[PDB]
Enzyme design. Sequence first.
Site, PDB file in Angstrom:
ATOM      1  N   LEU A 138      -4.399  -8.019  -3.287  1.00 23.34           N
ATOM      2  CA  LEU A 138      -3.129  -8.452  -3.847  1.00 23.34           C
ATOM      3  C   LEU A 138      -2.327  -7.237  -4.294  1.00 23.34           C
ATOM      4  O   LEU A 138      -2.888  -6.215  -4.698  1.00 23.34           O
ATOM      5  CB  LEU A 138      -3.338  -9.393  -5.032  1.00 23.34           C
ATOM      6  CG  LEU A 138      -3.935 -10.756  -4.697  1.00 23.34           C
ATOM      7  CD1 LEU A 138      -4.372 -11.460  -5.962  1.00 23.34           C
ATOM      8  CD2 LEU A 138      -2.930 -11.595  -3.933  1.00 23.34           C
ATOM      9  N   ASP A 139      -1.006  -7.360  -4.219  1.00 17.31           N
ATOM     10  CA  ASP A 139      -0.136  -6.255  -4.568  1.00 17.31           C
ATOM     11  C   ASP A 139      -0.153  -6.029  -6.077  1.00 17.31           C
ATOM     12  O   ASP A 139      -0.604  -6.887  -6.837  1.00 17.31           O
ATOM     13  CB  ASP A 139       1.289  -6.522  -4.090  1.00 17.31           C
ATOM     14  CG  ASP A 139       1.346  -7.029  -2.659  1.00 17.31           C
ATOM     15  OD1 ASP A 139       0.293  -7.068  -1.987  1.00 17.31           O
ATOM     16  OD2 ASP A 139       2.451  -7.392  -2.205  1.00 17.31           O
ATOM     17  N   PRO A 140       0.328  -4.872  -6.534  1.00 17.21           N
ATOM     18  CA  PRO A 140       0.269  -4.580  -7.973  1.00 17.21           C
ATOM     19  C   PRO A 140       0.912  -5.643  -8.847  1.00 17.21           C
ATOM     20  O   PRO A 140       0.402  -5.917  -9.939  1.00 17.21           O
ATOM     21  CB  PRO A 140       1.008  -3.243  -8.083  1.00 17.21           C
ATOM     22  CG  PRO A 140       0.849  -2.614  -6.768  1.00 17.21           C
ATOM     23  CD  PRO A 140       0.824  -3.723  -5.762  1.00 17.21           C
ATOM     24  N   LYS A 141       2.012  -6.251  -8.404  1.00 15.77           N
ATOM     25  CA  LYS A 141       2.784  -7.178  -9.223  1.00 15.77           C
ATOM     26  C   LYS A 141       2.452  -8.642  -8.965  1.00 15.77           C
ATOM     27  O   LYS A 141       3.113  -9.516  -9.529  1.00 15.77           O
ATOM     28  CB  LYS A 141       4.280  -6.959  -8.990  1.00 15.77           C
ATOM     29  CG  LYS A 141       5.081  -6.750 -10.256  1.00 15.77           C
ATOM     30  CD  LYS A 141       4.806  -5.392 -10.866  1.00 15.77           C
ATOM     31  CE  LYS A 141       5.749  -5.105 -12.015  1.00 15.77           C
ATOM     32  NZ  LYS A 141       5.074  -4.371 -13.119  1.00 15.77           N
ATOM     33  N   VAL A 142       1.456  -8.935  -8.134  1.00 12.70           N
ATOM     34  CA  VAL A 142       1.171 -10.294  -7.688  1.00 12.70           C
ATOM     35  C   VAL A 142      -0.079 -10.796  -8.390  1.00 12.70           C
ATOM     36  O   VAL A 142      -1.135 -10.156  -8.325  1.00 12.70           O
ATOM     37  CB  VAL A 142       0.996 -10.352  -6.162  1.00 12.70           C
ATOM     38  CG1 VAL A 142       0.613 -11.754  -5.725  1.00 12.70           C
ATOM     39  CG2 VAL A 142       2.268  -9.893  -5.474  1.00 12.70           C
TER      40      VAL A 142
END
Lengths: 126, 123, 331, 338, 59, 61, 91, 96
Positions: free
Chosen positions: D78-82
């Site tokens: 998962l991406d940093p902001k997700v």
Amino acid sequence: SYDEKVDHCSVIAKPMAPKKLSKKIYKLIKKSTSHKNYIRNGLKIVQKQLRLKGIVFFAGDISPIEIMCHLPAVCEEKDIPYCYTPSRKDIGAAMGTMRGCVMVLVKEHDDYKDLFDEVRGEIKLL
Amino acid sequence: CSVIAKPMAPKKLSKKIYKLIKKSTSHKNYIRNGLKIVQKQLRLGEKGIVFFAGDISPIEIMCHLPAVCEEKDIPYCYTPSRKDIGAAMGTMRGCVMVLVKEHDDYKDLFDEVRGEIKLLGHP
Amino acid sequence: PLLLKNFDRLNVRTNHYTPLPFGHSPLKRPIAEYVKAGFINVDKPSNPSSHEVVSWIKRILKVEKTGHSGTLDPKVTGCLIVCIDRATRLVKSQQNAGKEYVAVFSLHSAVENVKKVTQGLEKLRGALFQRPPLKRQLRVRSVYDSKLLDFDKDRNIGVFWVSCEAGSYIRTMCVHLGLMLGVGGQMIELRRVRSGIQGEKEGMVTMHDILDAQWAYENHKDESYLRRVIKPLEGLLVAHKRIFIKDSAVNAVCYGAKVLLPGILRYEDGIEIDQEIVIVTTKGEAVALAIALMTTSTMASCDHGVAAKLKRVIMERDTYPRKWGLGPKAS
Amino acid sequence: LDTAYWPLLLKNFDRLNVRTNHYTPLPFGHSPLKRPIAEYVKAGFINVDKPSNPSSHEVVSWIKRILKVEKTGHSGTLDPKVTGCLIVCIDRATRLVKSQQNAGKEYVAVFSLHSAVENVKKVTQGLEKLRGALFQRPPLRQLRVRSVYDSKLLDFDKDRNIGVFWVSCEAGSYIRTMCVHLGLMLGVGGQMIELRRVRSGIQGEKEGMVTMHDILDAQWAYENHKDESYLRRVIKPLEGLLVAHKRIFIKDSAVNAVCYGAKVLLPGILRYEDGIEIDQEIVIVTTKGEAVALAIALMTTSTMASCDHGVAAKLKRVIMERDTYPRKWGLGPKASHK
Amino acid sequence: MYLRYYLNENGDRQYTLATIDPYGKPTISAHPARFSPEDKYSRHRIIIKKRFGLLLTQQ
Amino acid sequence: MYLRYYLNENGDRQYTLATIDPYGKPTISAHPARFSPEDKYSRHRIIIKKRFGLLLTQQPE
Amino acid sequence: PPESVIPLGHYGWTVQDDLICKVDIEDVPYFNAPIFLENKEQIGKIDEIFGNLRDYFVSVKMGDNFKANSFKDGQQFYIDPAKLLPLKRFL
Amino acid sequence: QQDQGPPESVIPLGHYGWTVQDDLICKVDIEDVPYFNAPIFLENKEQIGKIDEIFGNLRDYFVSVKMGDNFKANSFKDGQQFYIDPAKLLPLKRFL
RNA sequence: CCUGCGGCGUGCACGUCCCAACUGGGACGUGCACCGGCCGCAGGAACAGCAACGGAGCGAUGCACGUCCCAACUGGGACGUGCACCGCUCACACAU
């Protein structure tokens, strides 16, 4: 109504200040705002000050509760009284701002030494 | 009161029992106070009336003394409370039980109390 | 019934078994054996000690042996478990049965509020150190839960309910609580409310009740009081994982033979390797306290082998006839 | 028998086909849900809920430093902001990370359009026209084709011109690109404000979700109170990740042979799950329920019922540690000499 | 003595230090009567508690 | 943040941007609470959640 | 007697004539362990160990020519290095 | 990543669809997936810009082109056909 | 032939300050995470045996009653009755 606002609140939102206590609490916040070093607003600043006295009023309409679910036990450990209020909007308004606040710490000054002391007692018996 | 507190004296009989206790205190020889003391006196076979207190818990501590009283034919009854008996003794200390013996000084009073007791009956 | 409740909920390996004319259900044993395989949940008075009350129960009952499953201090009332005769084989199994007290305490100085005492009680949770009250070998015992059932400020006196691990020194916990509320406190009264799986509401009779049952038995042959006073030793194992064993395998278990799969009528779901279980007959009698070497899946997936060895044989020998060696092979 | 309620790989134990019931069980190994604390921790996973700010790698490193485990990894990234689901395996389910990287993924995306549109039906039809094998580029490089099985417009508000839609997609599909493509299709452009994985494989919103604070609190409870129920709530046995595979139950003497590389030869098979096909990934398991390994069935289920000797499956990943059972191979009747 | 108890609706022993329970009825001490092996009054207790319907066998 | 949710009769999350429910209840935040590795309030969190019965261990299953 | 010393903990609170302390070091001290000072001067002995098995409180019965007030919060108490038990011992 | 060699012959790439900002969207009827930054041209081999995004289903999909100042996206009507350099057209097998 | 193991300056969290949400920024120091094939090592080469020869049962100061001194469902005193504080054997068992 103050009854459904309290009903909306979280299960951890106890001890809940009654209506008269809530009017008094809002008055205390509004008075304290007039002095810069006598209200600590926000999660970060309140947590910093508690870790480093007064009355800490929490907002019972927060979610997820994990953001400050521990701070009630912190207040119990540090002997700082605390109580929940039905909404963060009201605390923010009492702070002279539209934005709500999760919690607010109110210190103690001579100018309202009486005021503070009254609410303290009313929240110690709650 | 405990369910076992029978025979039970009415209000008037309770007052007359308190009067009998107070007069009998004149001759402490005719009074017997305490649970151990009343127990041993009943065992030795001392005649008189026995006034118990229904406010006793656990009832095992005295639940037998009514049975021995019936066995030896020593009529008895319960008062509303032990504090009333303590006040009758004026010792500011409750006494669950009392044994009253017969003296001439209060012969008529203890004669009325016992007649009323017999009238009270036993379940 | 007891030890047979929800027997249909147990996994069934085979309904084909051989009933025998031997054995009786634990709750209908003839009076002589009933006492021999029972125990009393007595209310310990405050003067005598646990040993003294056990000995008095022995003397009243006129029975061979008697023992108990937890030492109540001389001045501590509460529920005491007293196994009688054969049932004393289960005393060791109850050495670690979790306990529960209602302790009355006193503080040498007043507290700010009841909330202070409640918080101090709350923070005495989990595994805490404990020392025998005046050996000096510190132990560690766990308080599962605690509560301040009452406090009174004029007397400084409170009543708090605790659930603790077996062998916990409640007096030590009360000294800890006092020392934890900043004022100092000592336990002015104690009462074991629940020892293991037994408490007040579970047929907990008093010493006067034991004496009265003995008197009734002797003078009118009325054992009903004695039955209400003494409960089967099988009641101590209602929480144990049951393995029902056929009639022809019970005696082998009695002689120290291991429990083998070809004689398991039912095995309760939830059994695990190295699990303390109860090898019971089809009529509810605790044949033995065993350790299962096969999990329930292993028992379902196998047709023979060693199911559960024996840790402590409860049933006597010769209770069931010798009926091993006449299996399908007959070789 | 009533095996429907049994845990993890023992589910429907009685519905499986039975090759044989004859063997000598050994006491080695424990049921996965009842292992000691060490074996439970070393053979488990955590459906952790990712905090918004940090990365999946950061979450894995934090869980490592919290549970004090040597190795750990995450199935999907998962991406940093997700936020959303993040299955972090613990030191023995890491061997299933490769098999969990192809697992499906259901997201919930909040998107904002550059400027207003005609109506909500516009966005609905735009989303309906982006359901299929779509082209997608890596964000900030080769093009790839990723399938979006389903999508629904959960909500749309016009004043702020912002919508929320839920998408089921296969691994590697960047939902950010899907939002951008929806914007370009509506006829105005758009972007993504937030993303929230609601399902990572077979782990849904209600399926044992825990938070980082939950992990820390379970660790604290076990370390200070010596209490384990919290850590057993947080961590779950790796058999959970394998509840969808078709199972191959083996005899206890064959377990260590398989752990030693030996293929799953037919003689050491007790029960097998119906529906096995050639080249189909299956799980080699013990009767206790511990997944010995993951193999690739070289034989159907009918051939298994109608065969006596051969190789039933070929190993792909041994999970069970060596020597956890004895070397009870080679002592059979046909083992004196190869 | 110090520890007394009353009964709630379910009959669970509510343990309190108060002589009068919230419901207003008197409390009952949680302790049993002192026991003595040399106690000849078994008959006496049996007959009384059979009369008043308090014996265990009756429950 | 933008994304919030409410629980339906079956416990399934239903997501939405509104700050009030279809029934009236406030909408919970979808995003789980931020975590920091150097969190020193595990004991206090467990104290509070055990006081209010919110801790995981008190739920079924 | 003490050649050296180690930090057993810091001051907690007081309960009557006592020095309940917070013991940061895991190791359990020995019952009646002389709790020394920096400069090798004893200040009391242990009386009761209470608290959990990893971060607990030590009770000291101050005995000789010192008091429970002579120490102020934020002060560490010292212990003989060879007067402890491993924490697995009581587990 | 060649950036020279003015365009050679070209083949039809699709037909004009709609427009989104300066970016111009065209529906592709050919099967080959074009390169990224692949210049697009009219029938006169006059480059109009370069590929920006490729989105849509595997077979029938759409293509977004970003233009050099030499054109505005509104300058093209419905039905206008675009052209692509054959060399930059990769087959479907590369992504199948 | 199968298996196991290993190699091929951006953001994140906390900490101290300035200002202008469960927030969004900067500065100053901290730790945390990222930017298929080949090579080497190790084990084993596995058609999955074992329906009983060490298990079980035995032995190795306080309190209560009664009598007296006085001074609650009691706490004290004196003196009496009491109560509690390695060997043997059995089959050597897969359960009709």
